[PDB]
Design a protein around this nucleic acid. Structure first.
Ligand SMILES: Nc1ncnc2c1ncn2[C@@H]1O[C@H](COP(=O)(O)OP(=O)(O)OP(O)(O)=S)[C@@H](O)[C@H]1O
Ligand SMILES: Nc1ncnc2c1ncn2[C@@H]1O[C@H](COP(=O)(O)OP(=O)(O)O)[C@@H](O)[C@H]1O
Ligand SMILES: Nc1ncnc2c1ncn2[C@@H]1O[C@H](COP(=O)(O)OP(=O)(O)O)[C@@H](O)[C@H]1O
Ligand SMILES: [Mg+2]
Ligand SMILES: [Mg+2]
Ligand SMILES: [Mg+2]
Ligand SMILES: [Zn+2]
Lengths: 483, 310, 394, 209
DNA sequence: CGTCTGCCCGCTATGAGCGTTGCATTTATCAGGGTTCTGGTCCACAGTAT
DNA sequence: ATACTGTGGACCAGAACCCTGATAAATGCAACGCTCATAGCGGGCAGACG
């Protein structure tokens, strides 16, 4: 409900010239840096290491939600969705006439006069209805949720008493129905607008045709930018009716409404639309941007995307016995462990720290990752090996699989972390020592030798001169050690 | 369905599905398929059934029965898995758990029965009495329905009557006690009964879960076994000892009852095809008869041990 | 619909030593503790006496729904129902191979359409029958909802896969048509279990002959314990040939199939039974038991009396109020509670916060007029005068 | 389950596993024609809103629903008019989906319960019961059996309204009389000018206003 | 003896429950092609006759 | 010690099949039609007086 008054910027492109709907959108001149600025990450310092193990457990449990590293396909999706959004308003020009007036005027001018040739090709919808098919667990929903939220939803105009809804989101559920999408569109329009359209239009008495007929009216009345149907994978074919008639219903949806529409699905749902996809026919449309997991190798060498993501994710570790450099063996092993699927790669790293905080030594080993793999990836054993096989049928059959209820399992991990008796020697060292900003030198030089002499030496220097900066403290503690 | 009967000890799943419709007064053959599965195009098969997993979801609240136990302990799949090959054995389960039916017989390229050969419904005169006295019910059993030998491994010969699986493709039939079971004078070939007794323990044996010797392994094992006690001349097949052993232990009428004529005059004989390097799947009959002829004091499981180890 | 896993007892009687069905129930209780278990009352507490009037009115009005007291006969009824629901499982044992014979025979009756067809002569059935005739308003339905509430309804086993249903209750259709009893038996096992037996057995147009065998085999698909039939008087109102048809089918089921059945009805339904089983007759309570006043009436009156919710009330009861109750109500168990609740409601609403005989008389004569004509016959006591009408003692 | 183990092991001697519904009570209101038995009900029931929608659950609460009897008098039109009066308060098509001609009366009565439990119906008022005294209903005792077998509907206390011609003809049996006056039978009368030789303040105030 | 003005009763009108029937529906029947299958082929290779 | 012959492994190619689409016939099944029982009704007959 960000009801900002329309400030009309000027775009130098001739097609977007003097359109009240388009100009209210944010400008696009440095959007490449804006598109690459989606990156977000937690801020971690060395201070959080000496905290109690429950605080570290909470910090680790907070990593999945607030970590995002843009990749190659995100730029392409951002540019394509920008093109679809901004090219969708060349038809519904409010200041001049609509499309039908333009065609009628063109016919009247080509009849007599000297307008020799007029092309009646017009616009197919207004942009192609993209179909973003990809394997489940790859990260489509979060990508759209972030790259589609940088546009204000409602631009309340002043001279025209209309609402410029820029985007929208339908979402099906488990064992859905064909009429449920039509009802949910009306229901979800209320949350975006604050009205009560369900009371007057959401009656169950209406047939399937009347729902689309009213949707056309309301979509024409409010200047609509996009309509993102999501999670077609959840639908059940037999409950709604004929499976092959779903394609007819979706084509009818695309034709009647007229605004750009973008569906989402999994390779299981591909067979519904495969009839139109195989043909190169213009008018079928439904262009597909295939989502694929991260590939390890490129031109016989490791792909830069994989290492770039791996190092960035590996910088978030707060292990006590941690070494600075990632070993190559684990780099080799977890890719074959997880096949590069975007969701589970992060999940294995999340669960590894929780398991290592309780099993004993605080480090990362290949056996630990293997143990986590047999622990909490049981439902996804078939799909992973199907991806390893490479046969399209094996991948298609085992799609839509997801691990249930990981969040509840995280809570019992934390509860088990809470109840422990024995302590590590480093825990003893940090507890007995005055670790109030004096800890940092000890931590940075702990691994050089045994700390038995180190614990009183730093105290001796610090009591010798209580007022020091750590910057001057480091040369002195280094000098007294070698003696 | 709310009350799916649990399979008895050592019975086929076809009789279990039949008793799942005998127990609730469902007499229309269409409604049984409508309720058990939900599709009117599903077929009825004796041995190597498909659509399993739907039959296990009904028994899910009982924690014991699962897909693997159902296929290995309650089908005729144990006879084909060890001998054909390891990878085909491992992929048959994933091909069979789902709705695919045509590929099941094709991929296990031994089920080219064409016309239904001895797919008439069979039973045993003496076993039914024991089943009646200890249970109170009668059912089809895996011991009766050996693919080739029409003999109960313990005793006697099976009672053929006149019906077939192709008479009704979409009908599951349970054995009827009131349907008269009439005895006939037992005409038994003792060699066939001995072979059935020899081959019986392989059906229920835990070690047949994963042991499938490889094709090249089969070739080396057979060459070494032939050369151990002198069944092969210098780079030549003797052709005489192999014939005289099998003629000593087996007579010709047993072979014609098994439809496995030897052809010493003709160059193309299955016995010579076995000893030459293998390239296709072989039936259990040929391996069993070769094992019985070459060495008569070794069990099937330990025979597979010696075959697979070296 | 309370799915409960089963854990077995170890019974003492040798006849029940093997069954899981009869060893899954909670144990039968001695008559000493059974009387105390049935009783329930209201929480009361004196904190509500000084609260507002409206908040007190609903607490007063909640008396008839949450107040039950065990009388003399209910302790006999509980024992008889326990015996008659335990005696119907000794002939359907699944361990020793008896349910399989009782269930295999039922397929033959479905095939041929006759209920006398038998395949195994060794199959023997044990069952009992009862009828519970009582005057209307005597609270006989609530007795069969509180005695038969100790046993859980649906218990799920795990060695087998049977989902046993312990008790089921149906209501005969008002017209008494021979198809709707069979179509309503598939609508109690349809809700108490969460299934759709009705769609697979009722919509397909079958004859009554096959629909009768489908019931008798589906009831043995599970382990049905009790089929109690309420409101049996409507059976007399059906067409010709149906009055005897389901007075013979409901004795065929008890004798042959082996599912116990109990029938409950009004006194005017006794004629069809006698137009040709243990009989228990229920009568309205009376104070004049032999030569001295009955103790049950006094005890019940005191127990109900201690539930008053009036700020200024007489704690001790007077005998004149008891005589007024017995002369205005005649002891039928419905009138007393409603009369007392209405009297104290009017007392609260008027402003006079204490109950008197005059207020009872005024409320009875002003608010219960549709009920007076029948009570005149009960008050008079003349056998010929009381013989008219229906639903009266005969 | 815990009570079940406690009663199986002998610690607990009693438990209440499940209790069915026993909260169905009715009432009848009869008064002379023209005394205002309907405009004194619409205005009382106009304070409670009909349809209540809860976010936490997924049920719609229909507080009350008013049916009127037809002009000739039979049970089937009442049964179908329940559906015809239910599909208007909500947005639905129950009449064409369920109200077919194949179903008998008993099926309709057994089918009303599912809808009366899907939406938490609170009150069902039947007025103009006058028309059902004598008609082609198949029998007075059969129609009375219908009105008493209307107990199997799940709870939903009902209120019946009729002229004083309905009482004597319609309640002439103990088992049905005790269900009509299950919560007191309210009787109405016209205003009396002289209470006890003193003018009534009610009449004076009404006439003056 | 007309007529008369209200009675009846064989009748008409109508609810209640069940039973065919055309209708859609599924099922069953026939021509055809190409494909994997297995039957038959052969050819280098290894071991003996001159 | 090399030409002659068996021989095992690798290899062409016709053939049973068998899968599928186009078309006619048997058929189960909601869709009215029918039947049965039940309650009120207006022309007809006995009646009866001035
Ligand atoms: N022994 C009792 N103790 C307490 N309250 C009782 C007792 N018997 C009956 N009641 C009350 O009386 C009412 C029971 O009446 P119902 O449940 O209608 O049974 P019923 O109407 O007598 O059965 P019918 O007439 O054969 S349908 C409830 O309000 C009970 O609280
Ligand atoms: N760059 C990223 N960094 C961390 N996690 C990511 C990233 N991209 C995607 N994810 C993961 O993807 C998950 C959501 O995507 P997903 O569930 O596959 O979409 P859908 O629900 O449509 O299948 C999130 O749990 C998130 O952890
Ligand atoms: N308290 C009142 N004051 C004035 N008019 C009233 C009152 N009660 C009822 N009426 C009148 O009575 C009429 C409604 O009568 P109604 O309830 O339909 O009678 P019935 O119940 O016999 O159908 C209304 O027109 C209304 O004007
Ligand atoms: Mg998603
Ligand atoms: Mg009752
Ligand atoms: Mg009115
Ligand atoms: Zn036998």
């Amino acid at each position: 409900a960000t009801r900002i008054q329309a400030v009309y910027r000027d775009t130098g492109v001739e097609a977007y010239r003097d359109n009240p709907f388009i100009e209210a959108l944010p400008p696009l001149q440095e959007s490449v840096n804006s598109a690459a600025s989606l990156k977000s990450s937690l801020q971690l310092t060395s201070s959080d290491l000496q905290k109690s193990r429950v605080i570290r457990a909470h910090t680790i449990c907070r990593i999945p939600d607030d970590y995002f590293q843009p990749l190659g396909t995100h730029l392409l999706l951002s540019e394509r969705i920008s093109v679809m959004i901004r090219g969708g308003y060349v038809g519904r020009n409010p200041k001049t006439g609509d499309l039908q007036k333009h065609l009628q005027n063109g016919y009247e001018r080509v009849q007599t006069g000297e307008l020799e040739t007029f092309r009646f090709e017009e616009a197919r919808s207004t942009a192609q209805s993209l179909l973003l098919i990809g394997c489940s667990g790859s990260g489509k929903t979060t990508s759209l949720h972030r790259i589609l939220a940088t546009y204000p939803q409602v631009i309340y105009h002043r001279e025209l008493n209309v609402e410029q809804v820029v985007y929208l989101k339908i979402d099906c559920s488990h064992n859905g129905s064909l009429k449920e999408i039509c009802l949910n569109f009306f229901r979800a329009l209320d949350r975006a607008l604050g009205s009560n359209y369900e009371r007057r239009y959401g009656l169950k008495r209406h047939g399937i045709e009347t729902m689309l007929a009213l949707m056309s009216q309301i979509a024409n009345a409010h200047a609509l930018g996009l309509l993102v149907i999501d999670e077609i994978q959840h639908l059940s074919r037999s409950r709604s009716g004929g499976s092959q008639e779903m394609l007819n219903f979706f084509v009818t949806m695309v034709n009647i409404i007229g605004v750009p529409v973008m569906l989402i699905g999994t390779p299981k749902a591909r067979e519904i639309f495969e009839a139109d996809l195989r043909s190169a026919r213009r008018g079928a449309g439904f262009g597909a941007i295939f989502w694929d997991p991260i590939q390890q190798t490129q031109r016989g060498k490791p792909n830069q995307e994989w290492i770039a993501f791996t190092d960035n994710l590996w910088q978030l570790q707060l292990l006590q016995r941690k070494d600075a450099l990632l070993s190559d063996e684990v780099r080799d092993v977890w890719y074959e462990l997880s096949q590069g699927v975007m969701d589970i790669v992060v999940k294995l790293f999340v669960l590894a720290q929780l398991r290592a905080l309780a099993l004993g030594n605080e480090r990362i080993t290949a056996g630990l990752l293997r143990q986590v793999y047999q622990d909490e990836l049981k439902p996804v054993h078939p799909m992973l090996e199907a991806l390893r096989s490479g046969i399209p049928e094996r991948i298609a059959r085992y799609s839509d699989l997801v691990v249930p209820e990981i969040d509840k399992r995280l809570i019992q991990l934390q509860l088990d972390i809470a109840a422990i008796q024995e302590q590590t020697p480093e825990e003893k060292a940090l507890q007995e020592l005055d670790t109030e900003d004096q800890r940092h030198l000890y931590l940075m030089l702990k691994e050089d030798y045994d700390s038995s002499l180190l614990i009183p030496t730093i105290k001796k220097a610090f009591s010798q001169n209580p007022t020091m900066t750590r910057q001057k403290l480091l040369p002195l503690v280094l000098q007294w050690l070698m003696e | 369905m709310r009350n799916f009967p649990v399979p008895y000890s050592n019975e086929l799943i076809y009789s279990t599905i039949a008793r799942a419709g005998v127990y609730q007064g469902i007499v229309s053959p269409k409604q049984l398929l409508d309720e058990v599965y939900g599709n009117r195009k599903v077929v009825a098969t004796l041995g190597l059934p498909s659509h399993l997993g739907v039959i296990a979801r009904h028994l899910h609240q009982t924690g014991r029965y699962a897909v693997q136990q159902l296929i290995y302990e309650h089908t005729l799949f144990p006879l084909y898995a060890p001998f054909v090959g390891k990878e085909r054995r491992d992929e048959a389960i994933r091909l069979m758990e789902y709705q695919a039916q045509g590929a099941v017989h094709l991929m296990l390229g031994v089920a080219a029965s064409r016309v239904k050969s001895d797919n008439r419904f069979r039973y045993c005169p003496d076993c039914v009495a024991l089943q009646l006295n200890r249970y109170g019910e009668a059912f089809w059993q895996r011991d009766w329905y050996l693919p080739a030998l029409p003999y109960c491994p313990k005793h006697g010969a099976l009672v053929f009557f006149d019906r077939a699986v192709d008479d009704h493709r979409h009908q599951f039939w349970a054995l009827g006690h009131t349907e008269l079971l009439s005895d006939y004078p037992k005409d038994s070939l003792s060699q066939l009964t001995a072979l059935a007794a020899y081959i019986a323990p392989l059906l229920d044996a835990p070690r047949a879960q994963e042991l499938s010797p490889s094709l090249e392994q089969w070739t080396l094992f057979y060459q070494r076994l032939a050369q151990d006690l002198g069944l092969t001349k210098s780079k030549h097949i003797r052709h005489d000892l192999v014939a005289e052993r099998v003629r000593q232990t087996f007579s010709d009428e047993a072979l014609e009852k098994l439809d496995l004529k030897l052809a010493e005059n003709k160059d193309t004989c299955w016995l010579k095809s076995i000893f030459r390097k293998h390239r296709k799947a072989f039936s259990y009959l040929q391996h069993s008869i070769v094992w019985q002829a070459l060495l008569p004091k070794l069990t099937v499981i330990e025979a597979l041990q010696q075959a697979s180890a070296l």
